[PDB]
Each structure stands twice: as structure tokens, then as C-alpha cells.
Design a protein around this ligand. Structure first.
Ligand SMILES: Oc1ccc(C(=C2CCc3ccccc3C2)c2ccc(O)cc2)cc1
Ligand SMILES: Oc1ccc(C(=C2CCc3ccccc3C2)c2ccc(O)cc2)cc1
Lengths: 9, 234, 229, 10
């Protein structure tokens, strides 16, 4: 999940 | 806990400094058009604005207090609303035109979509006549992020969103009070601003339908992130 | 025009006087899509006739041209049906009171594809209204606001302002502080963004129902529906 | 014409 990544990273 | 501690002036200050930049499109006046090129331009543009929006959201007071699952949901719901109110804000001083980018300034006479365009034009026209302030705008955009997906185990989270929402309300009132507005004028202006959010929600929804239609018709590409975002609504 | 000369109490009593009645459905628990959508379509069709005569009694509305009246009704009708549904469902948590003889819960909305999502949102809004302890006087103010605002893109603006004055007036009469007043006001109006969302998602669902041609739509509903499509 | 046109009268 791309959006999930960017929030994390 | 940090968000509820802030003063209204600290809230505003925080929101102002979290503002993403205005990006450029790849538009070139010596380059031909058609619906493909334009939607491609706006898609490319939106896709880059998303990356800034995601990092902007993390700087919105209270947003990182939420679970990652909740943060994802709020953004999936609100992303087009937020792009659009961005589009409308920077289009204020350009009546009858939409400033997608500093180098991409469009009228209605270059469309087809035309009604979503007109709706955005009307909203911009509304901001202009209201003389919408930057401090009011950043409050509005943050409200959209927190509100739009809040009514869709534990939460807790949901009630916490209502607290920060409530804190953005006095901030708005606080803003209108220093502007010299009477109590009656404050209430009325508050109402006028929040009613605009219903229109922005409406434009977002009509926009997704056009975007979903655009994807299935496989006409010009959506990025991997934009596809994931769009799929959340379909 | 006469709307602006009205006082708050007068505004309130006029809106309460204009209220449409709660209609009944046909007198077996629906589960299939044909049965459920059949009952809901019949109901909405009758409700719409009352909505139209209600709308003509909302102060300021009649002062508009016929074409503008048409536009606003076409834009807002499902929103107005939905906030009505959500309101009368308040005292029945987890369920939707489409009619006093038609109480529906999640489990029936499970069938007919694309329904249970919109169902859940309506339940969540109803519950939200219940927790806020929304009052009938406030409800008719919100309903009026939806009618006048949803398709508004000067006169309407002034009337919209007048209704805001009325809302505040109601909260003040209830003994709320100034801070509680504009906080509660913001909360009410933010729910309007969700009602808009539910309407738009409902609208595409009804469009899907139409094209598939399972349930016969009335001519009035078909025209109200195509105004969006 | 529209049915709504007719209903908004009388
Ligand atoms: O800053 C912004 C950048 C792009 C948009 C997009 C929309 C999409 C819909 C639409 C239709 C007519 C006129 C404007 C718009 C705006 C948009 C969004 C996603 C996409 O893939 C294509 C266009 C809105 C604001
Ligand atoms: O008082 C009301 C009566 C009917 C409605 C209808 C909707 C339509 C969409 C929808 C989807 C899921 C759950 C509820 C609803 C409500 C509706 C409207 C028209 C129609 O032909 C069928 C259902 C809403 C309020």
C-alpha cells in the first residue's frame, strides 16, 4: 500500500 | 496531546508553516492539446501534489496522534477535496479562470468536465467575494482532512478527531474576532465557510466519477498512487 | 424577501409549520433487492410530493424564479430525504426508520450490492445526531439550509444568513454559552458535508438500479435522477 | 418540460 508507506516513511 | 495544548494563534502559525508549495505543471504553450494531454498534465501535477499533501497532513496538529490505518483512511477520503480547495484558493485573483499551476492557467473555453470546471469557478468566485483569508483557508483545509472520513473495536480516535475539529472552530472564530467582526458576523461567516465544504465535497465526488470513467477508458495513465487513491472511493 | 423581515421565533414556527408528515410504507420484511428497492422507491416518490410543497413554504424559496426552484430541488432532493431518514432514525440505534412500519437494519442492506456502505454512513450520521442531542427546531433549520445551499452555485445568501441567525438563536435559548453556540453550529454544519457525500453515493446507486431496470422508477424520480446523471 | 415545473405551481 503506497499511501501506507509514505505516512510511515 | 500536543494539538489540544496549542493556542489559536499557535494553531494558525503551525498550519501556515505546514503549507505545501505551489508546484509547476509540465505545460508548454508551444505544445498541442486534446483531452489526453490536459488530463495527463493535471494527473502528473496531482500525483506530485499528493506527496507534498501526505507530508503536510503529518504536520496537521493531531493527525499523527491517530493510528496509521486512520491516517490512511482520512487521506483516501479527502485527497481530491484538498487538491480542489487548493486549486480554488490559488485561483481567487484570476476570475473566470483556474490556476492549476503558475504556468497552467485555464479558462472554461478549453475543456471537455466543463461543469466541474464551472463549479470550481463558482467556488473561487465565492472565496473572492467573501475575501477569504489565508489563515481561514488553512483552517478550512485541515477541517476537510479530519472531517471528511470521520463517519466512515476502538475509537476513541473518532472522538479525538472531534476535539481537534472543535479546536479549529474557536481558531476560526478567534480569527474572525480580531478582524473586527461582530458576534453575528462571526457566526454568519463561520457558517458561510463551512457550507462551502459541502460544495467541495460535492465537486470531489463528481470528480472521482470522471476519474474512474477516465481510468476504465484507459486514455492517459494514472500513477500507481493515484490509482490506489481512486480505488478507495470506487 | 418576506423571509428577511421574519424574526427568529417566526422563522422557527414557519419551518415547523411547513414540516412534511412521516409517511408509511406498504403493509413482510424485505431482504431481496427487488423488494427493498421497491418499497423505498414507492416511499420516496410519495415523500417527494410532500417535499415540493414543503419547499414552497420555506421562507425565501418562493421568492426565487421557477427555474431556480427547480434547480435547488433537483440538486438537494436525496440530501433532504436522507437527513429526514437520519433524523427519525435517531431513537432507533443501529437501524433506519424509513417509515414507522419499515425499520431496516444492516443485515437486510447486506443484500443488494453497493447498499450496506451507504446504509452504514446513514447509521453513523443518525448516531452522531443522537449523541449531539439534535433538536427538532435545529433539524428543520438544517433541512432548509440544505435546500438553499446545495445548488447555490445574493438573496439566497441573505436567507442562508438568516437561518444561521435562527440556529444560533435556538442554541442561545437552550442556555448554551457563546463558545458552545459556535462550536455546536460548526458541528451541525460539518455533518452537512457528509449528507452531501451520502447523497452523491446514493445517486450513483440509484443510477445503477435504473440502468439494470429491476425496479420501476416513477417518472418524477426518473427526472430527479437524470438531473444528476 | 419537467414534472417538477408543474408541481411547484398551484
Ligand atoms: O491541484 C489540482 C490538480 C488536479 C486536480 C484535478 C481535478 C480533477 C477534475 C477536474 C475537472 C475539471 C477541472 C479541474 C479538475 C480538477 C485532478 C486530480 C487528479 C487527476 O488524476 C487529474 C486531475 C485538482 C486540483
Ligand atoms: O426517506 C427516504 C426514502 C428513500 C431513500 C432512498 C435512499 C437511496 C439510497 C440508499 C442506499 C442505501 C441505504 C439507504 C438509501 C436511501 C431512496 C430514494 C429513492 C429511491 O428510488 C430508492 C431509495 C432515502 C430516504
Amino acid at each position: 500500500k503506497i499511501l501506507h508507506r509514505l505516512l510511515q516513511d | 496531546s500536543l494539538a489540544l495544548s496549542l493556542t489559536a494563534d499557535q494553531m494558525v502559525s503551525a498550519l501556515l508553516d505546514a503549507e505545501p508549495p505551489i508546484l509547476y505543471s509540465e505545460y508548454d504553450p508551444t505544445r498541442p492539446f486534446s483531452e489526453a494531454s490536459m488530463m495527463g498534465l493535471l494527473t502528473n501535477l496531482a500525483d506530485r501534489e499528493l506527496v507534498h499533501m501526505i507530508n503536510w497532513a503529518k504536520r496537521v496538529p493531531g493527525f499523527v496522534d491517530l493510528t496509521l490505518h486512520d491516517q490512511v483512511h482520512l487521506l483516501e477520503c479527502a485527497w481530491l477535496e484538498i487538491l480542489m480547495i487548493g486549486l480554488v484558493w490559488r485561483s481567487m485573483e484570476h476570475p473566470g479562470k483556474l490556476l492549476f499551476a503558475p504556468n497552467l492557467l485555464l479558462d472554461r473555453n478549453q475543456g471537455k468536465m466543463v461543469e466541474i470546471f464551472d463549479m470550481l469557478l463558482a467556488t473561487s468566485s465565492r472565496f473572492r467575494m467573501m475575501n477569504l483569508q489565508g489563515e481561514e483557508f488553512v483552517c478550512l483545509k485541515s477541517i476537510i482532512l479530519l472531517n471528511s472520513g470521520v463517519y466512515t473495536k476502538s475509537l476513541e480516535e473518532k472522538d479525538h478527531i472531534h476535539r481537534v475539529l472543535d479546536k479549529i472552530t474557536d481558531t476560526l472564530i478567534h480569527l474572525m474576532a480580531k478582524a473586527g467582526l461582530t458576534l453575528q458576523q462571526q457566526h454568519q461567516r463561520l457558517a458561510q465557510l463551512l457550507l462551502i465544504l459541502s460544495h467541495i465535497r460535492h465537486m470531489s465526488n463528481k470528480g472521482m466519477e470522471h476519474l474512474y470513467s477516465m481510468k476504465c477508458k484507459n486514455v492517459v495513465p494514472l500513477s500507481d498512487l493515484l490509482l490506489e487513491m481512486l480505488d478507495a472511493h470506487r
